Write a protein that binds this DNA or RNA. Structure first.
Lengths: 74, 50, 53, 75
DNA sequence: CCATGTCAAGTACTTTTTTCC
DNA sequence: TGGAAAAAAGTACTTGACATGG
């Protein structure tokens, strides 16, 4: 797919969120959608609102979390 | 020690009213007087402070 | 009039509304014990405050 | 209303509040009153106080949140 | 000159938010 | 539940560089 390969910055997330992700070896939206809602809340400084935000901005573009992908990554 | 009108004008001209500095023209229109008069008043008020 | 004591002061200083003399940023800052930069920043802020009342 | 069409800046909100709004495609008080109190708390950097403030100042002028409007907008 | 004004960042302190137990 | 305590947004002020017209 075409929007799965893009950098996470295309999500125009908040700083908090952003920082968490870069702190988490997450660079591409593909890396992201594969992470379960639960697996995220564990990540430091990432909480309800941050999680919440992310779900909404993923939804705003067809995407949700916990997605099972194939042929990943390179 | 400046009259109501004197003070006004400088606040007008200097923008101290709405952040905008106003040409003689506009202030004159406001008080219903000629640009000349304004200036004359402005200057008078300026002299009054020095 | 929604301007602080300070904000107002500065514009009279700067605009000369004090002693008929318009003051450089340097002098006013010296007066309030601040840098010229600060003064400008305050002026402009107070200016913006009157465009949007 | 005549006050519904005005820019949100007429509210003289705090910076925080303001920024969140401009960050949220909210320019007109009309766009605003239509948003529910909840839908707002989601918006980043907008917490209780900001929310609280906003309700108060809308109230101070007759307005509240979650209002249902029609024929929107006028351009 | 060159003194004053303007810009882009940069440091340091307060307030609000947001996590997380 | 609720509240301490991290992190971010904001607010005051500095600094040095630049331009620029005075």
């Amino acid at each position: 797919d075409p929007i799965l390969l893009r950098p996470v910055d295309d999500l125009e997330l908040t700083v908090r969120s952003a920082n968490c992700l870069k702190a988490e070896a997450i660079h591409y939206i593909g890396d992201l959608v594969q992470r379960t809602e639960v697996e995220l809340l564990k990540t430091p400084n990432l909480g309800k609102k941050s999680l919440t935000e992310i779900k909404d901005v993923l939804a705003s573009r067809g995407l949700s979390l916990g997605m099972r992908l194939e042929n990943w990554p390179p | 020690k400046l009259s109501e009108r004197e003070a006004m004008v400088l606040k007008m001209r200097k923008g101290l009213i709405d952040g905008r500095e106003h040409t003689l023209e506009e202030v004159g229109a406001y008080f219903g007087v000629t640009r000349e008069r304004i200036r004359q008043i402005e200057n008078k008020a300026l002299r009054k402070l020095r």
